[PDB]
């Protein structure tokens, strides 16, 4: 089997991407944030505290003939930006782009933090990290990908995110028309539950490539590219007027600037992020200070190849017995 679903930016900045997912019988379609940096499929639901729902589409398990309470199971998750959610658990039939898993754990939110309430476009998350990160207790649950894997033609999914444009998540096959050149595969450590890999270096604009190992995670659920302070300083030093602002929370630059590209290494190959992908627009409405798409990982504890990096590439999440990551230009 295979599946193929279109993923769409939630706003004009590509702050996140939503993909329609069918849950239950008859189908209830929710727009979920596919997140290779977490392992819980959770949804706004008929159980979410009413004051914490503001325009989201909700899953109502009582209207699904295939929903079953996962008795006694609860979940609770905290994210890197300080947001969080928690609740109870059902199992139900879940379909993504034509690919169906029966008995998938669907984590129903009873509580969500303010940032989730305030984003009416995201109805929940679909976790695609390793199932060892799943927060369901007392019986840990598997991701949609792990449950689908044995049925897939090939044990893979791919992320082809667009820049201010739709893109595609495919399950079970590699669309050879979706990328240029060849796919460069690189080793993955699963020890922290993430798609954790090591980039081979970077270049700023037309500068000479610096060979240096940069461990990080491939995270479709993170907006920006978070890298060591040395790398990020070298990038922003090339932009007139750029500076790090503690009041804003990162590097800002004059909105009048044209940004240099940023290249990252994957083995001996190179992925080029165009400068425009690094522009996240005014820090506040009408400001002439713009927020940068490359930021320091210093506050985080881990480097994150988020959407800014991933949307420049066709990315293969290879869930074979030894997992690997593939990157191709596109």
């Amino acid at each position: 089997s295979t599946g193929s679903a279109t993923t769409t930016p939630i706003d004009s900045l590509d702050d996140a991407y939503i993909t329609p997912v069918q849950i239950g019988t008859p189908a209830q379609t929710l727009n979920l944030d596919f997140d290779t940096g977490s392992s819980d499929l959770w949804v706004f639901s008929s159980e979410t505290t009413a004051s914490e729902v503001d325009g989201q589409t909700i899953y109502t398990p009582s209207k699904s003939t295939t929903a079953k309470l996962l008795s006694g199971a609860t979940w609770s998750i905290s994210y890197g930006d300080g947001s969080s959610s928690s609740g109870d658990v059902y199992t139900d039939t879940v379909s993504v782009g034509g690919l169906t898993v029966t008995g998938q754990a669907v984590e129903s939110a009873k509580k969500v933090s303010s940032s989730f309430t305030e984003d009416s476009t995201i109805d929940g998350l679909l976790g695609l990290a390793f199932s060892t990160l799943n927060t369901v207790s007392p019986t840990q649950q598997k991701t949609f990908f792990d449950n689908a894997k044995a049925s897939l033609d090939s044990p893979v999914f791919t992320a082809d995110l667009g820049y201010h444009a739709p893109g595609t998540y495919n399950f079970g096959f590699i669309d050879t028309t979706a990328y240029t050149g060849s796919i460069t595969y690189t080793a993955v450590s699963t020890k922290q539950g993430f798609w954790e890999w090591t980039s081979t270096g970077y270049a700023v604009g037309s500068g000479t490539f610096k060979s240096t190992s940069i461990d990080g995670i491939a995270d479709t659920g993170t907006t920006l590219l978070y890298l060591p302070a040395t790398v990020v300083s070298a990038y922003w030093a090339q932009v007139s007027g750029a500076k790090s602002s503690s009041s804003v929370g990162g590097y800002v630059f004059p909105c009048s600037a044209t940004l240099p590209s940023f290249t990252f290494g994957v083995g001996s190959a190179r992925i080029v992020i165009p400068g425009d992908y690094i522009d996240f627009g005014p820090i506040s409405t009408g400001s002439s200070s713009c927020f940068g798409g490359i930021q320091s990982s210093a506050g985080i504890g881990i480097n994150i190849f988020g959407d800014v990096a991933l949307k420049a590439a066709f990315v293969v999440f290879n869930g074979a017995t030894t997992p690997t990551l593939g990157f191709a230009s596109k």
Binding site: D15, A16, D33, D35, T36, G37, S38, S39, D40, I77, S78, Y79, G80, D81, S83, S115, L125, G127, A129, L133, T135, G193, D219, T220, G221, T222, T223, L224, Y226, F280, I300, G301, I302, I304, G306
Partner: peptide, 6 residues
């Protein structure tokens, strides 16, 4: 930005 399970 958002940063998804730290």
């Amino acid at each position: 930005x958002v940063v998804x399970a730290x």
